[PDB]
From a paper:
S-Adenosyl-l-homocysteine hydrolase (SAHH) reversibly cleaves S-adenosyl-l-homocysteine, the product of S-adenosyl-l-methionine-dependent methylation reactions. The conversion of S-adenosyl-l-homocysteine into adenosine and l-homocysteine plays an important role in the regulation of the methyl cycle. SAHH depends on the cofactor nicotinamide adenine dinucleotide in its oxidised form (NAD+), which is self-regenerated during the catalytic cycle. The protein structure of SAHHs features three domains in a monomer, the active form is usually a homotetramer.
Author numbering:
A (entry chain A), B (entry chain B), C (entry chain A), D (entry chain B): 4 to 432
Write the structure that this text describes.
């Protein structure tokens, strides 16, 4: 029935001011507007969005609409919504169901309000984390035959997509947006490099300099976190299950040990694994007084937050999403955002510039699926490298980067199109 | 007349939460309390405090008090007070006069409230920037001979103490706390390394990576700001007048040029000079669209905000302390905190750990002035190197540092006492 | 006829001392010895090697032999051979045809002496740069039917392999060793990070701090070079044809412009493109006095060295592989190793630890091709990821890295073998 | 008696090549020549020089000479002389006594040759480490009153000048050149940042990346060595006695602990303390296999080489200045340069650019002492800040730095002369 549902529509004006500033920071999305506003390649699309409802996401949403699509939106995390952002989208006349600090039930509710449009069920999915994807496959399968495609933002979501596919249970063609190079090596890496510390700082205002910081996982996210921490004068310790990642981290000058060891040394703990059971009771019990513990992976499964609730003598809320626990042993643990995504949970997520790479990849994927479905049979697909290169290209102007153009002789020497793609498929950048 | 004036005494319970956390990050101040809470060296002291009313200052104030002093407090900047810290201090029955967003009229009023104690006038000054010092020399000279001592926090205020002495204005002994090693080369350096980005990020959420950031000045504050922005992937340009500082910046891989040049290139501008007329009209008319401009030196004379107010077509307020000016060239300038301290004005200032160095120096200074008048004629003095080292030593344990101890044979060889000082008076660290 | 041909067999003892020290640095190669010395998986193999004849290569050579193979060796660069290393191999009784400062004819000669063994023609190729591969395909095709496989070390060599294959002209199955992750993200990246500056320093002893350094190309090699230069206080400028690489470099805080621009600013120039025509006459003529110019890509085609020889007023040899040119314009250019590989040309190549990753990959490839030819039809192949992970694993012990082992529950959550591989094929690390 | 003594006068033509190059990296020294070659301020000076006989010193010597001085030279370390630099200086008709690999007997002989000029005894000392100073005070006191001045290069020698004064031993005015800002905080810092790794690499070709490097001391030399090893991916542990330096290292993300602890962890050991008994038997018996041990502080008392010589089962010489000791535990220690200066002993010392700062200070000191005796009583003096800044200014242009110029209004505001000094005497930079 409702046109939207947000925390306070009164925050619309401020949101709009924030949207204005962010647009000017997001040239990938803006170029998409220049190119495709007239031709409206998305007319007919009915896109249900499940993705952190922030200022950046607002710019993506309004890009989808300018491209002719109908869009309904919900956040993919109970803490991540930026209320002023949601307000602006709602006031603009776009159905959005999102607010900071939802309950687990308000969460599923919001998502369901994205499923039905004036003209019928949804026919495109833009998902971050697999939640909207899974909800349709298991709760509303009858809607699967009317969906042309899914595009998936984050590494956990795509992981799930692969597992669905190899189990025969995926029924809609899916583009893996996470593993666009202009996503995974930008958003995951440099985004977290700037938003992790933001989140810790806003929550706790602790000094990084002189701390021991333990980062679990050294993939794209863990790389960015580690480097951000080291940059501020923290001594950074890494844990890893993958020998290749571990050698990388050792070659960069980090000590790489087990959580079972590092729990006794760290003052700050950051989980980036995307895997269950990373920081447990046995670890909490050995930590230094006032350890800070927070997770940055997509789901809050990495930290045993239940163990704290059940086993602490004392639990004091310092403020929204900041909890201080007193244990049997007389020491305290500070826990951030109840173990959910700390950058989005306790701050404002990645900054808008890098998000423009992510969101540009999303737009192209939506066009690709909507306009070229034949290209995309049931399964999980990458964007072509030429498009990947295009998104990066689109962001060079704003940083005043001058790109070298190959001469004809050069292109022939390298046996390469003068216009790219400039790399083979297996290139790792 | 008021027993205190704050924004909201209701914020006192949160404030106390914040204080409990802070104390645990501030072993220096705590060592001071466990050492002198019994003997009460500041028995009889009446300290008037003009210094940013933050959580960190709260802990400082309570240290003073537990050491027997009576204290009355105001903030030394109009935007830097933390309301919950102020409230927690007022709730504890300590007269404080401070809130975020005072007018210039209210600012002077607050400093005035600190002059008079039930038992007569102030006999001690603790100052950051020298406004309290100037006010009593300029406007209340009859109180001068009743004041035993001044301790001064910051580069600007300490510079002013030097000018006053050499002009025969200064009528009270002063201690130069800024130029303690454990202050200048820690709080100035590492403090700003963490709190500059925090201010920019909270205000604007801009991405540092890929930007050109121009840092005016490369003293202690400049070094820290530059390193911070470098660390996140900004390309940093420095301006300097001092050939030594200039050569230092160059040897660290920073381009050094003039504002005249650099204003055409920067996306972000931080002044750190302590000097007037750093960024002017001619710089502004040449800046890239949406250039972010802010100041981190003690007073707001570095950026010609006057020029923006008189010349802009339109000033749009974004949120407290964030303004977007539209210029006659069609470009926009984002100014933070009306050109006042960005870290304190837009974030939370330095974290508590580093403030513990500065504040421990502050406490020792008060003790030295009040307990040992005879040692300090009218002039500007440094704390002894012995105490300077003590401050450092007192933060070691919290970080799990194991300092080495000279053997007798080594001490003999180096010709120093086993227990310090370990460095000649001219040592630069 | 000859058993070997080296600069001076008298350098054998010193070489052996150097080999002893390096073994202890190369656990990948040593584990290969433990595992396979008894079973001799390479008995019957007749491996012709064309790869820089350094201490590290010596350890690989003796690993091949311990694994049962017959080996004959030549260097793949006229300047790269380490004479004491070649001496040790020769004195050990292994046919080696290698010495520092060969002529272009002595070079082809050496390579040809690797082709024939006591029992017949060669049947395995271990190549770095495609030279031995190409020589057989075009000069001695009659030997192609008796070769089981090729393994290729460097990015230029594999590029060529791909071009051969898609032109129908490759006739032997080839493993791409370069693009093992434990090669490309280690050897290319961290190797050059340490050997580029080594090479510049030994040649010229210049101060990096305060210089402008221009690095052409920002792939694996360019990444390592850039970071090494920046680490010493050089201001680093990057050129690139690939938008993705360019954005990476901009996001790390480097200025990215064209050579046409950078030629006027740089004091040091490093080419890492693997492409022709990077630094030309038009560039040389605009460079600062005493610019240093050197190449680190596989072939000496990147710098127009002919243009210098033809157009300089004056050419003075400072010492082996160090040339100083005086131009028409009165300024000087310093050119390193006549434009050939500077790390190997003017120093000692990558250090032995990282080379162990490279060489371990080589050994596995040789075993793979020799022992499992059916697995490898004509074409270009990667090592399986499980083997890639094995090489990294083999190096963890020596750095005292402790790797986390997945629990059963965890492995099931991630839907992954408890033992790896832990990453999908498209992962970029 | 000899007009000079060098290893080979035949190396003079290469040496001159090296000199031509060096001069171009040393604008400070050149400025000095273009300024004073006419007026000849050192007319009548007879400077005896004891300072590492390197290319850089050659340029220094020639500057002195062109300024009218007569000069006789010896090296201040047995392994640091560069034979071609020595030869080029001897060929130019300047008495020098210096070669790489002197015995202790030859070392003292060489210093002796510098005392007597055709016109009678030396009237000026230019010293690095204080051996020339000690020798004339201890053994030739009758020459004392004939000497006008001493200028002293290094921390150790300058420390000794302080001890001699405070013991009433020092009978000549001395200038403390080390503690020039443009010296200590450049040559000590950035010099070692480049020349430490060069020494290790030339000697051993070990990989820094992934190693644990232990750095004893964290003064200016320690800071530079630590940064260098960090930059290449070593994990660096610091030891310190000074709580200030210790806290600094901690705030930069380095673990700080004791040698007693750290000797069990390090792969590489650099002493920087200037102090005796840093690495002892108990450290050696606990080190990892093939630990590399070296010293970069001025004399060789930091590592107990005596212990290794008496206790090792077997010492294998590898090449000049590289020894591998076999221990009774079966492990090996690699000692560099018999525990003497590793950068100068195993490589080429600092590059010429930074030496130009130190040497320009050296020249100004000689000018000040010789031209203005009246200004300098017996004691230890600093150069004025004005000259300190001049040195810096003189290196700016070569780096294309544009220093800003205070307007009159700013200078008035800051209360300083437009042309400096820009900093109070206590400023630490
Ligand atoms: N804005 C954000 O907060 C943000 C950004 C992007 C991605 N993510 C999420 O972050 C997580 C990681 O993303 P990524 O791109 O770095 O993925 P990734 O695949 O690169 O994985 C990180 C690493 O975790 C390691 N790991 C797994 N289990 C481990 C264990 N038990 N102990 C230690 N290490 C372990 C793996 O070896 C892997 O290298 C995912 O959940 C992803 O969706 C969050
Ligand atoms: N938390 C904070 O915000 C904080 C912390 C410490 C001090 N400060 C303030 O920051 C300012 C700088 O402090 P500092 O301790 O680094 O002082 P400093 O003297 O070490 O550094 C200031 C530098 O600015 C340079 N400079 C002066 N005028 C200039 C001009 N016109 N253009 C370019 N460079 C110029 C000077 O050469 C000097 O090197 C002072 O006002 C100080 O009180 C703020
Ligand atoms: N020991 C060594 O010296 C050593 C080590 C490994 C590789 N190599 C050689 O180094 C070269 C590069 O290796 P890599 O692994 O970094 O390869 P890479 O494919 O990562 O390429 C480097 C980059 O060069 C860029 N490029 C190409 N033409 C250009 C041009 N005209 N201007 C600017 N940029 C241009 C490409 O965009 C690419 O990103 C190859 O020749 C390789 O064989 C040498
Ligand atoms: N080119 C070169 O090789 C070069 C350059 C400059 C100076 N030096 C020499 O290097 C040495 C260090 O020089 P600096 O200028 O850094 O002096 P510094 O006083 O700044 O640093 C020495 C540091 O060592 C610490 N220390 C002393 N004894 C120690 C111990 N037992 N354990 C741990 N730490 C200890 C001291 O606290 C001090 O901080 C001196 O001998 C100096 O002459 C060599
Ligand atoms: O500010 C933001 N707005 C929207 N999405 C964001 C922001 N910051 C990070 N992510 C996204 O969150 C995913 C994990 O769920 C990441 O993959 C990232 O793309
Ligand atoms: O969090 C804080 N609380 C209180 N004072 C602070 C904080 N951060 C920085 N300063 C102080 O502000 C002065 C400049 O006016 C600096 O000298 C610094 O010590
Ligand atoms: O010290 C070395 N010994 C042998 N090969 C080396 C060394 N350093 C680098 N390379 C190799 O040279 C290739 C380019 O021809 C690189 O790919 C690298 O693996
Ligand atoms: O290349 C060089 N030539 C000459 N002296 C040098 C060089 N590098 C460092 N030092 C000098 O050696 C002293 C320690 O004995 C240092 O003070 C430094 O200035
Ligand atoms: Na954001
Ligand atoms: Na704070
Ligand atoms: Na090597
Ligand atoms: Na040198």
């Amino acid at each position: 029935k409702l046109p939207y549902k947000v925390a306070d529509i009164g925050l619309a004006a401020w949101g709009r001011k924030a949207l204005d500033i962010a647009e000017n920071e997001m040239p990938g999305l803006m170029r998409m507007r220049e190119m495709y506003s007239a031709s409206k390649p998305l007319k007919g699309a009915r896109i249900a969005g499940c993705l952190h409802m922030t200022v950046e996401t607002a710019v993506l949403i309004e890009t989808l609409v300018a491209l002719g699509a109908e869009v309904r939106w919900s956040s993919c995390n109970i803490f991540s919504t930026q209320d002023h952002a949601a307000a602006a989208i709602a006031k603009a006349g776009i159905p959005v169901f999102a607010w900071k600090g939802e309950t687990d039930e308000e969460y599923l509710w919001c998502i369901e309000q994205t499923l039905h449009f004036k003209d019928g069920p949804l026919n495109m999915i833009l998902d971050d984390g697999g939640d909207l994807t899974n909800l349709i496959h298991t709760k509303y399968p009858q809607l699967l035959s009317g969906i042309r495609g899914i595009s998936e933002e984050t590494t956990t979501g795509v992981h799930n997509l692969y597992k669905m596919m190899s189990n025969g249970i995926l029924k809609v063609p899916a583009i893996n947006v996470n593993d666009s190079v202009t996503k995974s090596k930008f958003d995951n890496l440099y985004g977290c490099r700037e938003s992790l510390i933001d989140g810790i700082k806003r929550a706790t205002d602790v000094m990084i300099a002189g701390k021991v910081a333990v980062v679990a996982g050294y993939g794209d996210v863990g790389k960015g976190c580690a480097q951000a921490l080291r940059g501020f004068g923290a001594r950074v310790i890494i844990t890893e299950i993958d020998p290749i990642n571990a050698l990388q981290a050792a070659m960069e000058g980090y000590e790489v040990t087990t959580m079972d060891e590092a729990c006794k040394e760290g003052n700050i703990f950051v989980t980036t694994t995307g895997c269950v059971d990373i920081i447990l009771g046995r670890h909490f019990e050995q930590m230094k007084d006032d350890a800070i513990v927070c997770n940055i992976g997509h789901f809050d499964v990495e930290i045993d937050v239940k163990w704290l609730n059940e086993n602490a003598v004392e639990k004091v809320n310092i403020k929204p999403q900041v909890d201080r626990y007193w244990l049997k042993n007389g020491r305290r643990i500070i826990l951030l955002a109840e173990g959910r995504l700390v950058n989005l949970g306790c701050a404002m997520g990645h900054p808008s510039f890098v998000m423009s790479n992510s969101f540009t990849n999303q737009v192209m994927a939506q066009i690709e699926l909507w306009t070229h479905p034949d290209k995309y049979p049931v399964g999980v697909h990458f964007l072509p490298k030429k498009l990947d290169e295009a998104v990066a290209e689109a962001h060079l102007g704003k940083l005043n980067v001058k790109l070298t153009k190959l001469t004809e002789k050069q292109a022939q020497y390298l046996g390469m199109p003068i216009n790219g793609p400039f790399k083979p498929d297996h290139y790792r950048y």
